[PDB]
Amino acid sequence: NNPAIKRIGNHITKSPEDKREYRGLELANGIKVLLISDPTTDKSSAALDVHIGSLSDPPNIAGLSHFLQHMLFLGTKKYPKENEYSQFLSEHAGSSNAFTSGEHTNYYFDVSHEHLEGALDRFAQFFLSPLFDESAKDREVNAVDSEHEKNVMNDAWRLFQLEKATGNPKHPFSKFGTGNKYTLETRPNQEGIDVRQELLKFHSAYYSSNLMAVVVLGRESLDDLTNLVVKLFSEVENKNVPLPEFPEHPFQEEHLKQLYKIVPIKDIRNLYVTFPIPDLQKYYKSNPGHYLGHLIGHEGPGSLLSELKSKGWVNTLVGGQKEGARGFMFFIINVDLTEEGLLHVEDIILHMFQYIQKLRAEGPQEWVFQELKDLNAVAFRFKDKERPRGYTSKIAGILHYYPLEEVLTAEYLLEEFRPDLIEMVLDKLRPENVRVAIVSKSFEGKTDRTEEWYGTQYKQEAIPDEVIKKWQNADLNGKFKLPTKNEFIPTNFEILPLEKEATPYPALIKDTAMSKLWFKQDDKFFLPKANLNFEFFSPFAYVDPLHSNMAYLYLELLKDSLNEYAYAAELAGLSYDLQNTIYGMYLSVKGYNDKQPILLKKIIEKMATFEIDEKRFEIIKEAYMRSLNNFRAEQPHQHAMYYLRLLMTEVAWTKDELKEALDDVTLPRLKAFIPQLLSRLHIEALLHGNITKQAALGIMQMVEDTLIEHAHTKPLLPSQLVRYREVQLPDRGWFVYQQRNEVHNNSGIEIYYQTDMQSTSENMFLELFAQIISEPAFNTLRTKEQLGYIVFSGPRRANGIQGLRFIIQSEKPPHYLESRVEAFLITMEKSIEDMTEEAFQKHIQALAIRRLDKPKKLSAESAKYWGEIISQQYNFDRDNTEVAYLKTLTKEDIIKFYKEMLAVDAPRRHKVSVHVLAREMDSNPVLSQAPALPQPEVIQNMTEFKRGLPLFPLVKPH
């Protein structure tokens, strides 16, 4: 009945468990829309996906569509204030982000449910009347450059662009998508191009209503949501832009049967096998790509990976279809290489073609397709409820590909087995259509080519016909069998009825010396799933570097063993996580409760009776060595956070102390360690979900019983159960720790102002203050000053202590960033005194909403509880108490907090700074005016540093 609405979609198919309400519709201008009504959501959300990406970039301005995406946040004609959008969301419990792919640019936000319209209106202007301020463009060009700079020494990006560079140079697929200062500023200036106009023009030419999809989620009715969205988005202009397509494959025969030898930054060994294939998106209802990927990428018994692992050539394998763009795709088989595998690359690839041959001989298996269909059906029915911001964004993306009534189910539900399509794709998987890339340090100095954008050192060879012919003649290897029927597929979806004595929070229902068991029956979600969380305490886990290493190798060897067995369970919605910690071991099993007890016993039982294979020990141990070394190639700001963690923690083995001790880890020594580790334990657990109290106690009983039976485990004392402390900085102190990043040519810095031990008061001062300066900090340090792409502020919580932290990755020297952060703090001081009481109450409200936002899924709630448990604070009612206190804070309260704890001349300022110098930088100790800074005490040695200071107390439990 509305002229602006071309059609209103029918019943939108959803899971019976989904209580959200849906109406799909298509606007007169062509915008596809999905309206989502959820009366309980504390945060509303919307997203818009344009069906243009960097593949549509002008060939002379690489990264333009990406740059466009940055600029839309920087002002519209209706809301011309540069950070009006960001500031609004921040003051209303909201957030926003975006991304640019080959074919899509995706924008999304969430906000307090009370302010959907205000946010939605400002959001809409991106597509109505963007400003593209000349000043803003010249600044933000730097943020894009920074973002690229961060990727240059990253192995994943280097390889990503290299494949693009080794195909047809005239194909859009070869374009550089990110852009940098050269492509965006330097070269355009040479050519005389007005980049601001090219931005305006690109938005004008491609950001058309016929290529847009919109999703909006709020508390409002589907009716009110309809009027709101139509009111705002029917005014979007339709230029009837043809949807871009790329029918010709980027890989022609000149690019097939080619071998590439590549040199990585990190010490890694990879083999990448690629086949060009047709666009399989139209066959989505049968999805031939996923069927083949599922088998080739199978990790269970009989699989290709199983064989390659037995010969000790590979450890992990990825197989399946890989996105390209409209018109083309790829099929890939990727493995990591052992030192041995690197020598048998030709043989590995033969094995791949033998398995593929095994599939041709067997023919398509309908029961396999039928199994994938069945698993996905269950997956969609009992799908966890998504957080709004990610939901609207994801759906906005696939609205382009599917009918309105089917968007929710399209990517889950399979219709009909099409063996013809399977044979079609399988026919492309031949030696004559293969591309091979080997990534190894062993090719260093032996390369002759250099990729233009990342500087990747590589070498190109043609695969000799002698080798190609060998691969085409692939005899059936007897080691290869099709996967067996997945026996972990859940059958019992019964939701057990809430017990009479069921608690709203976890209740302590068992307290022996052996174990402490926390339990809660789910009363919010009612899906047939449960989370089993176990912390195993033992002093021998982190007593020294040698033992810390062995704790790690033990679990890694344990998982390496269970993989083939647990893989089926993972496919069937039943996963486990097993990590070594500073307190001992951490075990988490999550998923459908049905066959969950089966898996859990297998782990605990495997744990306590583990027999170590020597070959796996050698391989896994060597990988760990490279793993520790590879930390040198991490980002400067990641180093910054790592170094600070070491400085401020009572005990912390550095990655150097670890890799040194590793040389002393032997098989005999490790075999001895495991039993010693399991001989003494204390188990603390949280069982949460679709389980009864007796089933919970039964579960706990089985873990203890299995340990005692196989490992002869015994309890640990209460006094032995004290956690580590945080170093306590002196009043008016300032320490600086300086290191260099050998790989990246950006500097990193973390600045930590340590306030005080955690408590309701200190928590809310810090959080309310962080809330107030969150947006302004991003706007000043990045948007205005453009110090870096990565600019972060917020609370730091470790060992029961807390403080305010700033993190920045930049091309400027760390000492420069210091004055700028300090300059900002003085700036913020004035802004808060000038702040109106109403603006202040907005921040109190924004923080309050964020804290009280309820978990949409079980594991989110489980995390909340488990956080209170491992922190041994046990404050399960924390949010209500702290939000209550928050609302009683004064603007004067925050000013005093700042002046006492954080201000430059503050009495109780405890400041430590970590400086990470860029690769080619050098040493130096020490716009809005930056204050004078005292001379810092330069930390020369972490041990001396810790020993010379007090340690905080630990927070007492509830």
Ligand SMILES: O=C(C[C@@H](Cc1ccc2ccccc2c1)n1cc(CNC(=O)c2ccc(F)cc2)nn1)NO
């Ligand atoms: O790079 C991108 C995505 C990103 C880059 C980014 C975004 C946030 C980051 C946060 C911490 C460290 C690093 C970050 C890098 N992007 C965001 C925007 C708009 N900014 C906000 O909405 C915004 C965020 C936070 C605030 F407090 C206030 C406002 N434009 N591009 N697209 O190409």
Ligand SMILES: [Zn+2]
């Ligand atoms: Zn970006």
